[model samples]
Target: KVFGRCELAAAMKRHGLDNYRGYSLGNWVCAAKFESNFNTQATNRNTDGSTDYGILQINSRWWCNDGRTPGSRNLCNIPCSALLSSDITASVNCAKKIVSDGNGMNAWVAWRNRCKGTDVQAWIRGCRL
Candidate 1:
């Protein structure tokens, strides 16, 4: 409910992610599109038994713990379910923390496989910033 369209600058200003933290608006938008199609509630189970959560599709193995399942590392000290909402505050904080630790967005399969070096500006084009 909170991830799509604008420049879709709604996200850019909301998170100010575009180049604000060394990634582009296109990069964030492209990752969101490929990972969750802007749906904050998106979740996927990995083949390894870990789960990908929320707008960023963050992995449970290192980030949040969903209580029902056992998790690893637990870097963010949050519940995985906290990530699956439009609020996006917890999601954004956790994602940023990963990059700060040198993981970068490449930590995301979606970012590495889809948005890494491709032309992603179109993701933020055609809409008013």
Candidate 2:
């Protein structure tokens, strides 16, 4: 599923991503924009054979188990495909686990490189929350 900025923002907010770990809803939206282009089916294969899943691109190495990443922790204890659905419940929950694990939103390089230190509010402007 490809989401418009506001649509993704509303979905994340509904799942309580706003201000999660001190990261704003805008931050989440901004990160999603870059990470998966708001596409729920987005996936990226890593050089190490790990895969990134879903709109948030949860990693297969640590977050979700795809059965391809050797010794995957599956810390989220979920199937990687669960994150690729438009539901986002699994993805959001896993993302919270990832953030709370220690690195906060910095767990996502897209957030660190793009959403971090940027005017993320623009990503949600004109969206009626």
Candidate 3:
């Protein structure tokens, strides 16, 4: 049951939203794109060389605090950074939770706009999710 970028995008779309404050689909997409290029299995190290893994780029060290090794078999039980490993569904759900809690996705859209040097709102014009 491996999920690809489209699958991940679709999942995010299902829970995707637009809001007045912070979190929004565009923001989440921006974050995901910036972090992993929407890659569910993305893994990389930060500039400081710390391990950041998975679609949301969850950090291994931070996510491992719940007593679960970052890539361990049982790592899916934690929140936020737990998605650092590879449980796509869990990771996407975690992202959904975060976006829902914050300013929705508008903040992410703004971030994306700033990072890509384009109009984020325009980029997401026809985006379904």
Candidate 4:
């Protein structure tokens, strides 16, 4: 969405994603940057036919239903469009569920392919609770 890093950090900090769960704020924000550059409405087609949705880029293959796609598990039990909003409560909550399910941010290929071990301080610079 059209938001600052700190603004997003404030929202994410309140999400209760414990580092113990591997959903660290750094990793989360970094992944968002890579996936959508903080644009909530972001969507992209994968190498396959499926699409990725929203800031965390939750895939339609499992987490959400874009409706255009078939065979979606919809494990998050929400629409893919729901994740594409500035009000990310549904998105964050659903994302947390994925991390809770043992994938962590590694659930998204962007997190594992780029955000991991990279300097993401810029994503939360000047961000405070």
Candidate 5:
């Protein structure tokens, strides 16, 4: 599904991310795609034999201490499906918090640099949001 710019902008605003379109959402979407094909409910046993869940592929054990089962504390409390659900804005805001740590944009830039294309830095620089 294509992410409408207006909707994305609205989501960003709701999350208190009024100035963060440059690379944060792009990088997050890239990570989510790589990790779980953007499947908000995805779960799998990783190579390390640990359970990974959600679009961000958050490890259930480390993130919430619950198993990968749906509605479990680990899977449900994290709100991983926010990435794709109606509450995408809240999900994105949460991701920004995790990356920013209530500070600057370094974490988001770094994630974009590492996970995007070969010229990901350029992409980040050229982004309008």
Candidate 6:
């Protein structure tokens, strides 16, 4: 499922992403935009032999177990396929776990390059969240 901008914003906010570890709802929304364009089925293969999955692009190397990434931490303790569901709750929880692991939003290069130090609020404007 590909979410509309406001739909994702509202969902993220409802999932407690607002001010989550000092990152705003817009920041998460912006990161999602760049990471997977809000598409739950999005997946990408990294050059480092890891795969990124789902809307937030949780990585197989450290977050999910794809049985492919070398020394995968599987910190989320879930199959990588779980992140592809349209529900998104698993993805959101894993994202929070990623932040709590001390990486913060910087875990996503797309967020750093496109959302960080920029007007991320625009991503959530008029969302009514």
Clashes of each: 1, 0, 9, 3, 2, 0
**Compared with the true structure, what per-residue lDDT tens digits does model 5 show for residues 1-129?**
334444444444556655454554444544555565555566677565556545455554434444344444442355444444545543554555555554343333434545755443332344455
Best by the TM-score measure:
2
Estimated TM-score per prediction?
0.88, 0.97, 0.54, 0.88, 0.47, 0.96
Q: List model 1 lDDT by residue over 10-53, tens digit each.
A: 65457657675688778878888888888889899988788889
| Clash list (residue pairs), candidate 2 | none
Clash pairs (backbone) in predicted model 3 = 22-103, 22-104, 23-103, 23-104, 23-105, 24-104, 24-105, 27-108, 27-109
Stretches of candidate 6 off by over 4 Å are: none
Cα lDDT for residue 34, model 4? 83
Residue by residue across 45-93, what tens digits does model 6's lDDT show? 9999999999999999999999889977899999999999988889999
2-116: candidate 3 lDDT, tens digit per residue: 3444455556666433432344455555567677776666667656545555666665443423343443332334643456545465666554554555454433443445544
Residue 13 lDDT, candidate 3, scale 0-100? 63
**How high is the CA lDDT of each candidate model?**
0.78, 0.92, 0.52, 0.79, 0.48, 0.92
Model 5 per-residue lDDT at 6: 43
Model 5 residue 129 distance off true place after TM-score fit, in angstroms: 7.3
